[PDB]
Point group: C2
Chain length 361, copies 2
């Protein structure tokens, strides 16, 4: 059984260091908001080329906190792609803002920047850009729109750790960015984890407070805060793995290129990489998706759909069910993710391509 | 220096077992919502005598989830002691409910049951009892009241793991209970951690979904949920320690009773318990609190204040600052916590008593 994402394979490279750092943190007696958090933050900040990195409990928290720290009014509007993972939207509604859902470009799977301005209203306060599947969004126009209409840009970076746009990294393309380090992400923890990145000193300091109960100083609560912190253990594990993140992303680039160069099947539309793509998810598109998934499973290849029901169609968002978003809806009916990881064996990726080429419907 | 809480001493007993479990989880390649969580949950349910335990990310999330799951209307009222830790109140306001702050009994530091009924209104939906410092609340009148008015009882168990009221454990004394396993809790993780306990099947399934993005089935989101999970690793650490929790609590009793029997100083009011007490914190009370804390530090003994500013006085709740709660305010001006731990050295507790006896002020 070739697994969709073999984490033990990804992480076995680091066991001996992992155990070392664990023992160290044991030796320290310090498990929360300590020197491993500081060290990881400082390194990830350098990595994204930003001034400030605040470790938090997960990527949904990271998003929810950024939105919270802006103090928007109830029903203020945040423009967001309609085809993202639900978490992006959950962060908006958690904060009693209104998500304004924009169709993607079929050629990027990212928000179509040409479709945003028409949806901008007096209630709009932000654009949440999502670098979906690993590919950075085309920022040029979004940035112009944000300057023009006095909007914040919030990056959801949970799928594109390390992707580059012009001179900058994801995380440094907007006003503030949220990252997930859930274990299957291109930089994955061994438990839940997240961070926020920004260059603004005041904003960063406010975020630190809000993620630690609303307290800047012992005994005192300046804001109504959250408990959303990155555990020492998880910061340590992340820092060890961050050293090899670009390498890992490159190993993904190699497998994706192999897929792109070798899968030749009329029933399958392959993903393109118009801008930098770190290939978190290798997403193909076919009118016979569920059939493909079954076929692959029959050949001992596990595949997972990202994603089959779009946020507007979910039961939790009944009041959005009527929205007509046919590009999003078609994608959701048609996509399927092929196994990819930095450690994935040659024999395994060759088998995926060979079996796809044999699929004859 | 005698530190207020030496987690290295608490935890070093278990170091070999922690390391064993960590490797086992590395072997598993399964870090979230797995077998360690299930095992721990099962054992903590047993420990509390409840049907269901849901591990979640922290004790504040645990409370916030419980209130969320009840789906109360905006400005629905929740009665709550006025002198608890701010997390108890944060859970209420986050959910857009109005906290109705009740004075404690000066002789228990828990909510005075006799002061609740007069504050009940048509908008009241719940009573959140807090077992402060480790002492269980006198539950009988509270349970009768909730039944009389069709209110939910929410237990904030963050500080009282394993305390017993008549025939039941804290966690099994209302409709649903929230627990913190913050590292310095009587049952402390190595990272942030918490849980929710309940006997109600439907509430338990709803909470599991609300803690996992609102998802009860792969690809579907029934609710607008959040991400609040207990890492496999922390579940494993908690399960190791849980087997020693009653032993450890009784060891804390022995030390507290030593303090109670041996400290005699006209300047200090001891925390004589009226109900079972697992002594998470051992809180004394003096008119010269700031002078006391300095004196102890002069004698190389670290103390902390639980707590110096009450919620209604915090800058984050300026809409509550006007409230006249003099018992609460008095407590906050006069309390200080002394070091206690089930592994605390005899010379250390003896020192603390002797040095306090010598204090002439
Ligand atoms: Cl996440
Ligand atoms: Cl076949
Ligand atoms: Na966590």
């Amino acid at each position: 059984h070739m697994f969709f994402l073999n984490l033990k394979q990804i992480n076995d490279r680091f066991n001996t260091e992992f155990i070392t750092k664990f023992k160290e943190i044991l030796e320290s007696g310090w498990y929360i908001l300590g020197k491993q958090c500081e060290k990881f933050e400082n390194n990830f900040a350098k990595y994204c080329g930003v001034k400030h990195c605040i470790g938090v409990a997960n990527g949904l928290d990271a998003l929810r906190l950024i939105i919270k720290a802006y103090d928007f009014k109830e029903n203020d509007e945040i423009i967001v792609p309609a085809n993202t993972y639900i978490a992006s939207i959950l962060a908006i509604t958690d904060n009693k803002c209104k998500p304004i859902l924009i169709e993607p470009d079929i050629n990027t799977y990212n928000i179509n920047p040409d479709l945003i301005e028409e949806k901008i209203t007096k209630k709009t306060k932000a654009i949440m850009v999502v670098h979906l599947y690993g590919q950075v969004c085309d920022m040029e126009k979004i940035q112009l729109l944000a300057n023009k209409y006095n909007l914040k840009i919030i990056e959801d970076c949970a799928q594109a750790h390390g992707a580059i746009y012009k001179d900058k990294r994801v995380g440094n393309l907007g006003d503030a960015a949220g990252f997930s380090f859930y274990p299957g992400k291109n930089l994955g923890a061994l438990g839940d984890a997240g961070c926020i990145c920004t260059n603004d000193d005041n904003f960063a300091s406010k975020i630190r407070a809000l993620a630690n109960y609303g307290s800047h100083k012992k005994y005192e609560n300046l804001y109504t805060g959250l408990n959303s912190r990155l555990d020492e253990i998880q910061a340590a594990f992340l820092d060890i793995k961050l050293k090899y993140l670009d390498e890992d992303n490159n190993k993904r680039k190699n497998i994706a290129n192999f897929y792109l160069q070798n899968i030749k099947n009329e029933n399958i539309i392959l993903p393109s990489n118009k801008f930098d793509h770190v290939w978190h998810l290798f997403v193909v598109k076919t009118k016979l998706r569920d059939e493909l998934q079954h076929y692959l499973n029959n050949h001992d290849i596990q595949t997972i759909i990202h994603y089959p029901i779009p946020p507007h169609k979910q039961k939790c968002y009944k009041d959005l069910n009527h929205l007509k978003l046919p590009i999003t809806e078609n994608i959701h009916q048609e996509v399927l993710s092929l196994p990819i990881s930095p450690t994935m064996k040659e024999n395994d990726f060759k088998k995926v391509a060979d079996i796809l080429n044999k699929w004859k419907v």
